[PDB]
Amino acid sequence: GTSQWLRKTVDSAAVILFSKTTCPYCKKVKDVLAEAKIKHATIELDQLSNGSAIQKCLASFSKIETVPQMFVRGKFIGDSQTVLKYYSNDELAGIVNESKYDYDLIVIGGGSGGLAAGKEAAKYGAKTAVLDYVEPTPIGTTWGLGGTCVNVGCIPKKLMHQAGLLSHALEDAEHFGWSLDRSKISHNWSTMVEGVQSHIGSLNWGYKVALRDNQVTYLNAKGRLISPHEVQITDKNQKVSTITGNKIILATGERPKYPEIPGAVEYGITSDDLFSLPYFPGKTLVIGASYVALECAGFLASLGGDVTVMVRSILLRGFDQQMAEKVGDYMENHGVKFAKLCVPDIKQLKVVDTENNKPGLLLVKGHYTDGKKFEEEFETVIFAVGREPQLSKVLCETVGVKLDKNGRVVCTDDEQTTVSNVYAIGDINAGKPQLTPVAIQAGRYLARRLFAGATELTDYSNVATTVFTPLEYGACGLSEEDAIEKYGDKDIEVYHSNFKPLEWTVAHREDNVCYMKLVCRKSDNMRVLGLHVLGPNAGEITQGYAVAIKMGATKADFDRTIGIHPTCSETFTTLHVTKKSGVSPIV
Amino acid sequence: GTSQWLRKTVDSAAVILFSKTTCPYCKKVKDVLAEAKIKHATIELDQLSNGSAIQKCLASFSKIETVPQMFVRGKFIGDSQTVLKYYSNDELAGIVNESKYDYDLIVIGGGSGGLAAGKEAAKYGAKTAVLDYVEPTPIGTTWGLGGTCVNVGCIPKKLMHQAGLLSHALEDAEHFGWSLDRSKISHNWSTMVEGVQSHIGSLNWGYKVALRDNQVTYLNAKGRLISPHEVQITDKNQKVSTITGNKIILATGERPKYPEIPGAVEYGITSDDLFSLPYFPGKTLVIGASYVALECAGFLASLGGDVTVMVRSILLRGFDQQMAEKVGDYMENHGVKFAKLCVPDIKQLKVVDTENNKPGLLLVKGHYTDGKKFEEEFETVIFAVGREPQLSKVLCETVGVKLDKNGRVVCTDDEQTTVSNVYAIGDINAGKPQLTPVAIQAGRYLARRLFAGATELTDYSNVATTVFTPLEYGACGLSEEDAIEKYGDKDIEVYHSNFKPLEWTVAHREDNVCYMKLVCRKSDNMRVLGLHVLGPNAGEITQGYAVAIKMGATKADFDRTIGIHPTCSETFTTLHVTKKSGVSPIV
Numbered sequence A, B: 001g002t003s004q005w006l007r008k009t010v011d012s013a014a015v016i017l018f019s020k021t022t023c024p025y026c027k028k029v030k031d032v033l034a035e036a037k038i039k040h041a042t043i044e045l046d047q048l049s050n051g052s053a054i055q056k057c058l059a060s061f062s063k064i065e066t067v068p069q070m071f072v073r074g075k076f077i078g079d080s081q082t083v084l085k086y087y088s089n090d091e092l093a094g095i096v097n098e099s100k101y102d103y104d105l106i107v108i109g110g111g112s113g114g115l116a117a118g119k120e121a122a123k124y125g126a127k128t129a130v131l132d133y134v135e136p137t138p139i140g141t142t143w144g145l146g147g148t149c150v151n152v153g154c155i156p157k158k159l160m161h162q163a164g165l166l167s168h169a170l171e172d173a174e175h176f177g178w179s180l181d182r183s184k185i186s187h188n189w190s191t192m193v194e195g196v197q198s199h200i201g202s203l204n205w206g207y208k209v210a211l212r213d214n215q216v217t218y219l220n221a222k223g224r225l226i227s228p229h230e231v232q233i234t235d236k237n238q239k240v241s242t243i244t245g246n247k248i249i250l251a252t253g254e255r256p257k258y259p260e261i262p263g264a265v266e267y268g269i270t271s272d273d274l275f276s277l278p279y280f281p282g283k284t285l286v287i288g289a290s291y292v293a294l295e296c297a298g299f300l301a302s303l304g305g306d307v308t309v310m311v312r313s314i315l316l317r318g319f320d321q322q323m324a325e326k327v328g329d330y331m332e333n334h335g336v337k338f339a340k341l342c343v344p345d346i347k348q349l350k351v352v353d354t355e356n357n358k359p360g361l362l363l364v365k366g367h368y369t370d371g372k373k374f375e376e377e378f379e380t381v382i383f384a385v386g387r388e389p390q391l392s393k394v395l396c397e398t399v400g401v402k403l404d405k406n407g408r409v410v411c412t413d414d415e416q417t418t419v420s421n422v423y424a425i426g427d428i429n430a431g432k433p434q435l436t437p438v439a440i441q442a443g444r445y446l447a448r449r450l451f452a453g454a455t456e457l458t459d460y461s462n463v464a465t466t467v468f469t470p471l472e473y474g475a476c477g478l479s480e481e482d483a484i485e486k487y488g489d490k491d492i493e494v495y496h497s498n499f500k501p502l503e504w505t506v507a508h509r510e511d512n513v514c515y516m517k518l519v520c521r522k523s524d525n526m527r528v529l530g531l532h533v534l535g536p537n538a539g540e541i542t543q544g545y546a547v548a549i550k551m552g553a554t555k556a557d558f559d560r561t562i563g564i565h566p567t568c569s570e571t572f573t574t575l576h577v578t579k580k581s582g583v584s585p586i587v
């Protein structure tokens, strides 16, 4: 119980001090450690309900039951007198740096999860290295430190979404009294990309400064785990060497897939290339139906592009399908064309004009599910048909780390793999939501358990999401069809309503396109199982409700809470029309 | 408790049917009442906890313990045979329509609370009248049905706020690649007012249609309660008559105050006049420091006005003063001038030019709090120095309804006045938050208790707010200073952080102006006592957290909930810097 926790804490902490808030001897040790610039974890036994028991259990390691007690990498170092002896004799530095390994922690992968984990571990005195390398895309695209979200993901895509949203802000402004003429205004792609890339570059730099300031070793090198404690590194001159670490965190993420058809790799691109592309894509085909495919098609259309989406079966597989259809219907009414039930079988007509900064030209041939043919010309073809890890590049099979059928790492609920000192976080952790805030929380909480004696786990249930399509879609919890599957139709009640943002009235926008619903369980006091909203600022709307759902909110909790007026979100506080009543949700 | 409840429900309901969902005899009576277009409340006993005990208590009125049983204004009417007997003999309509009074409910005042109460009561078969009259402002301004929020409050001010926000959207668009030149674009006040007023006109019409479709009598007439059941009405020709009603709801609201100084009434205006003003205000002085004053000064500055605010002492008295100061400093850096610690002692230099649609010119004289004098010319002067009811207009003193020292109605926790059949809701209910969603909930919940046997009360605690200044300010719960006063500084912990919206990066806006904090009580599991946020879309951010605070959220509930990325709201899910630690909150 307590004895198994304390044994795990002492064995894996790099430098840790067992202490009491009221002890002047403990303050003296803390003061010396800060002078020497020795970072460490601290456990204050008068803050724990069973601190009395823990302090007796410490004697099993040190043969004493007093505070303070200092440990380094599993070894009792001393009490107050002994630590001060080592300091005044100039022996303490060499003691706190003694290790069987080069590093207490090696993180393979410098993205959302890996950077968060490495910074948190270094705070408690773990000597840490972060490895990051970006394998170039087929056309040669590469980028800096920070991972998929920072460089080719959430950050550039929401900036480009905002450039798209501003098109409708320019339109609205005339109705609110401003003198501009929207039909006379055009968009400059390269000016936008330059501004987006300048911000990304400031993030690349900020991460390198943060690692430097936390005393983390950053290696721009590709890592491969060749045994439980050995990592082979290849640098930018193909120099190969080996470094060793006590704990290993795998955090290498995923990359886009291509279909196995002629011309796909040679002549199409992916999201990896889009966010730094030097020319406007022009007339564009997006192949796929994920949130990546629809978000990219959406902003390209708002920026004035001629955009088509090729859909194999359905939009947004895995999300609530009533909401997915409403998302696509809005896109189609606002200029995005859809080739439904269709797959591709890519021919090059013109090479990309790198001189004049212009796209090439491609012939796309495909077929509909009934066998009819598809054939049309496009300037750019973007593939958004899923993402995958490539761990047979990071991980020698002899190490013994178990992978599932999709190539992701099978982990315990505390991120441990089948090898005791090796852990995995982020998109490569099998079965977990693949989101930046999840990877960050997992990485921070893991570092605290390894190096500061924490026990708290990451909670992966009911994590909210937002799809940043031209009209945004926020969700938290089950889809309506998943709720009915799990509990049966007779135990599910759905409250819903259309709404119109007040901002849309003077601007003469649509009356009954925005929509929201709560999916509830009758036999469990009308517990809210899932929340869904389509409208502007849907991520801001959804976030706060995610705390209430974590807390077990019921329909009655929504009813008794008062709305803020005038807002979109307040419509959730007065819902009353059920789907089983058959009454229209229009307002 | 069961027997005194049923007594109160039967005496109060206009038409009510006690029923069971499984009974075909009940179904037959429902369809007869529907065919007859007789509206009524229904109590399904096979869905209540103590439904078996109520069924037996019904015999004290009807001498039967069986179901269905229908009652009209306190009298038992009959079972299934007896009701069809009345229907077959064409006796039913005369029975359901017999009453001592003209109406079951008279609502005095057709604003946010009054219209909501009237429509909900009519749902249960209560014969209802709604009286509304708008007394003109000193310069003669008047408007249509719907109250302060609809015509001269939340709706027009947030539309005008949006027109102001679009000026900075026009500025941002250049940085995101759009080809306009903000510096050559101007704003037309009269075009914006026409769009705003056309939307308000559609709401006036919608409310009249809604009342007609619910069989509610709408009288555009001034009402005066002269006895507990008698309302004297004066129509548009000052024809005076009297109508009678069983229950009365006072819902007459407030109007702006003027200071007691020369020239104020003659030459100044209030928010009542601003939202339909036919000329641009020009160089404007706003006198006051309430959320009304700051919201109005805010959008006038963003439209291009030369705007000054004259402040007697502090901004936003009653709100968290750290947050109020941040609100005002942002406004001062973005064009609003402030005349601090200053009060007015108004002279007319030019009369308003109603023909050429031009403002007049005024000389304002005042003094600062030490002794220096204030003297400057303005084209428009706006007073926002509080609001008050004038219930002497509405309520004869002899009726016996107790008012407080401010002229508001003293009520019980179920809105009852000191006269048993008279109730008050909305801004005139003493001590309650003066907000439109509060008035709507109160009115709806009260109507259900009067006419459908409901017991649920309106919960007035922890009601969230938003101030729609140029940078918006949302809050739910206690200010920091009120928490410290209530519990003591050692029992309060405050977590806080600056943030920067992602949308502001490419647009080159400010790094550390947006700000958020959680005020928590240490000795109660670090319960969240109050939430505060300064930033864009603050009302959408705050709303969802109000449900969590209503359910008693702690800091650990915020910690275990995962963020949505990229949003402003997600910063609440990872707060960690305490005020007590002294660490900087900047990003």
Ligand SMILES: Cc1cc2nc3c(=O)[nH]c(=O)nc-3n(C[C@H](O)[C@H](O)[C@H](O)COP(=O)(O)OP(=O)(O)OC[C@H]3O[C@@H](n4cnc5c(N)ncnc54)[C@H](O)[C@@H]3O)c2cc1C
Pocket (backbone or CB within 6 Å): A108, A109, A110, A111, A112, A113, A114, A131, A132, A133, A134, A135, A146, A147, A148, A149, A150, A152, A153, A154, A155, A157, A221, A222, A223, A224, A251, A252, A253, A254, A271, A292, A393, A394, A425, A426, A427, A428, A434, A435, A436, A437, A439, B564, B565, B566
């Ligand atoms: C277009 C797009 C949009 C997205 N939008 C959002 C959004 O709005 N919100 C959201 O929450 N999520 C979004 N995501 C998902 C988000 O990007 C991921 O969930 C997140 O980046 C996962 O972080 P990670 O640490 O697991 O991996 P990554 O961020 O992918 O980091 C892994 C890093 O390790 C490097 N690496 C790989 N192999 C090696 C090796 N052998 N040695 C060294 N380094 C190596 C990789 O090059 C990379 O730099 C989006 C993703 C995409 C593609």
Ligand SMILES: Cc1cc2nc3c(=O)[nH]c(=O)nc-3n(C[C@H](O)[C@H](O)[C@H](O)COP(=O)(O)OP(=O)(O)OC[C@H]3O[C@@H](n4cnc5c(N)ncnc54)[C@H](O)[C@@H]3O)c2cc1C
Pocket (backbone or CB within 6 Å): A564, A565, A566, B108, B109, B110, B111, B112, B113, B114, B131, B132, B133, B134, B135, B146, B147, B148, B149, B150, B152, B153, B154, B155, B157, B221, B222, B223, B224, B251, B252, B253, B254, B271, B292, B393, B394, B425, B426, B427, B428, B434, B435, B436, B437, B439
């Ligand atoms: C500028 C401004 C901005 C505001 N912004 C917001 C906001 O963003 N959010 C928010 O929640 N609240 C806001 N409010 C507050 C909101 O308007 C009020 O809380 C709400 O309107 C109160 O509703 P009510 O039913 O109590 O009264 P009202 O809506 O004022 O309705 C009362 C009606 O009764 C009429 N009446 C008066 N006497 C008589 C009589 N003798 N006979 C017949 N009829 C009579 C009045 O003319 C009026 O039409 C704002 C207020 C102002 C002034």
Ligand SMILES: Cn1nccc1C(=O)NCc1cccs1
Pocket (backbone or CB within 6 Å): A402, A410, A411, A412, A416, A417, A418, A419, A420, A421
């Ligand atoms: C069975 N399994 N599948 C994946 C991960 C595991 C597991 O139990 N790992 C925990 C360990 C403790 C010691 C060494 S590994």
Ligand SMILES: Cn1nccc1C(=O)NCc1cccs1
Pocket (backbone or CB within 6 Å): A558, A559, A560, A573, A574, A575, A576, B441, B444
């Ligand atoms: C008041 N309330 N709290 C919870 C559910 C309800 C409710 O019945 N809403 C009524 C209407 C909302 C919008 C138009 S009518």
Ligand SMILES: Cn1nccc1C(=O)NCc1cccs1
Pocket (backbone or CB within 6 Å): B402, B410, B411, B412, B416, B417, B418, B419, B420
């Ligand atoms: C009149 N009445 N009938 C039953 C209950 C009441 C009542 O308490 N009225 C409200 C009050 C306001 C101030 C003091 S009491």
Ligand SMILES: Cn1nccc1C(=O)NCc1cccs1
Pocket (backbone or CB within 6 Å): A441, A444, B558, B559, B560, B573, B574, B575, B576
């Ligand atoms: C991870 N977490 N969950 C709850 C509170 C925290 C925390 O300590 N936040 C760390 C940082 C936030 C922003 C920059 S560093």
